[PDB]
Design an enzyme around this catalytic site. Structure first.
Site, mmCIF file in Angstrom:
data_model
loop_
_atom_site.group_PDB
_atom_site.id
_atom_site.type_symbol
_atom_site.label_atom_id
_atom_site.label_comp_id
_atom_site.label_asym_id
_atom_site.label_seq_id
_atom_site.Cartn_x
_atom_site.Cartn_y
_atom_site.Cartn_z
ATOM 1 N N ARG A 101 -1.450 -0.886 6.056
ATOM 2 C CA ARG A 101 -2.614 -0.822 5.136
ATOM 3 C C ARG A 101 -2.631 -2.028 4.185
ATOM 4 O O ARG A 101 -3.670 -2.254 3.609
ATOM 5 C CB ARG A 101 -2.592 0.504 4.371
ATOM 6 C CG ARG A 101 -2.721 1.716 5.275
ATOM 7 C CD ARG A 101 -3.057 3.005 4.552
ATOM 8 N NE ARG A 101 -2.677 4.114 5.410
ATOM 9 C CZ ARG A 101 -3.399 4.568 6.427
ATOM 10 N NH1 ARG A 101 -4.575 4.025 6.698
ATOM 11 N NH2 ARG A 101 -2.942 5.567 7.172
ATOM 12 N N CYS B 139 0.889 -1.187 0.000
ATOM 13 C CA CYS B 139 0.000 0.000 0.000
ATOM 14 C C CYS B 139 0.914 1.220 0.000
ATOM 15 O O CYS B 139 1.868 1.209 -0.790
ATOM 16 C CB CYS B 139 -0.991 -0.014 1.166
ATOM 17 S SG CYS B 139 -2.285 1.266 1.045
#
Lengths: 298, 298
Positions: free
Chosen positions: B250, B245
């Site tokens: 994330r 990410c």
């Protein structure tokens, strides 16, 4: 095209790397001479520039447009030919902020193995303060041929993994003390050159780059520079020295001081600099204004 | 502490990695069970949390305070003991944004070789929507001993130089298409997770992480997930898959989908992610919504 015999440059390791305002004024128009404006603020050129002078724009001309690297030798050849520079041309570079970017341009030329590149001591400041003439005329240049040579990153450029293996060998961090200490991740004026993390590379000596320049914009006398780098930051003959800022553009001036004015034989610019280092995974960082003990080579 | 027999989880590769809201409600207070809130917004815990539940704060608890890396096994041991978790404890993790951070916490636990970690399908969303009880009482926990184990980055974590050597093997970029294409360097809501450069790693397949979650916050059925990753992003049995990410926090959700719901055997989280990659020197980048041809392994 001849050398500047100024007694001031004569103490320096490579006096041939410097020309005065008075020498350049005497030499404007000479065959074998091309003058290059290399400015952090690329818009200054259009306000007034040294007659016959061309511009190199660091935003568009010197970097790959998408990827983080300097151009290749084909794009460099097309850049220099378009500006009437041949392999044998003496190139004199001047620009704003006390030749901060002029040094960066000189550094890129050296990657491409262009021998006769020289800085105009005092850059735009000292040309302006001595009331010498600018023009706003877009100069008019006959295109030349410049050879395609492979870019040489061996001698003057350092990558991340080179700096990780460098601990126990000297590091100059040329950033404001506040960035050095990790009080700020970046300088106030450059929000887009921050990182995730704040501090410096452990064992790095803080020598903000401006200290190597007099108020007039000229490089300080060798003695003053000896005080800064030899006594102050603890460099001695034979040392493999790596210098870093936020971006390599900003650490080029110090590179130029260490390599051409003090004559350190092994001097690399870590262009990744803090924008790379402070966003990299599992690389050593310390805070505080103390250099720090180095960790084991990674 | 037992497994959730829900027919929904049974199709998944590791059904033991999931528990329902109804199972956890039935199991609150059980000896051998500790519930952990892991939220991107760490302040939600104090608004109301699952009774008996402790908090892990990604800003203070999971990262080295100065340097870009996850804590070591001593700090992890002190974290878990302080919260009454022993080596043999079943840990159930839930949090905001459809278990985005819950997955990240599960990933950190796995680095430390904690076996029985499980996600509460639907996280805070589905606990709230089924009107199950929160408390604002600071829960009260007897401290336990947790062993000091060395962190294992071998199996589920990828460094930069691992991703440079990965070309020809599959890459999932879980960022918004606009970041993928290089139209933005970052998501609008995260200005401090930008990079110098914009685009994606050449050959990366764009699978924004949210698509693996239903609107209710639960993981999509295996078939829907098969559509996304197998047909869509072209993953097949045996593939060494790296997901990225902006930050590793994330990309943990997708890691969890590929490894525990689809049962890919070799799945690494590139935690450096775009904050590292888009600021690194001389690493491959392309723009556009086409994955791109991979370059030669670096």
């Amino acid at each position: 095209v001849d050398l500047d015999p100024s007694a001031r440059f004569a103490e320096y390791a490579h006096p041939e790397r410097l020309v005065s305002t008075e020498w350049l004024a005497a030499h404007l128009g000479d065959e074998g001479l091309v003058v290059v404006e290399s400015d952090e603020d690329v818009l200054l050129y259009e306000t007034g520039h040294i007659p016959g002078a061309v511009k190199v724009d660091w935003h568009t001309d010197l970097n790959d447009p998408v990827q983080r690297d300097y151009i290749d030798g084909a794009a460099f050849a097309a850049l220099l030919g378009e500006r009437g520079i041949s392999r044998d041309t003496t190139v004199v570079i001047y620009g704003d902020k006390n030749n901060w970017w002029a040094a960066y341009a000189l550094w890129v030329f050296t990657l491409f193995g262009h021998d006769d590149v020289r800085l105009l001591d005092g850059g735009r400041s000292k040309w302006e303060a001595e009331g010498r003439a600018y023009t706003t005329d877009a100069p008019t240049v006959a295109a030349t041929s410049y050879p395609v040579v492979e870019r040489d990153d061996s001698r003057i450029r350092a990558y991340r993994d080179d700096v990780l293996a460098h601990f126990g060998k000297p590091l100059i961090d040329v950033r404001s003390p506040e960035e050095f200490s990790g009080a700020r991740t970046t300088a106030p004026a450059y929000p887009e050159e921050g990182a995730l993390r704040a501090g410096h590379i452990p064992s790095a000596q803080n020598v903000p780059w401006g200290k190597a320049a007099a108020e007039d914009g000229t490089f300080r006398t060798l003695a003053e520079l000896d005080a800064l780098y030899r006594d102050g930051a603890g460099l001695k003959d034979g040392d493999d020295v790596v210098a870093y800022c936020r971006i390599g553009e900003r650490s080029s001036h110090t590179w130029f001081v260490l390599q051409h004015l003090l004559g350190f034989e092994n001097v690399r610019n870590y262009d990744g600099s803090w924008t790379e280092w402070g966003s990299a995974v599992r690389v050593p960082i310390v805070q505080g204004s103390e250099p720090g003990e180095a960790p084991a080579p990674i």
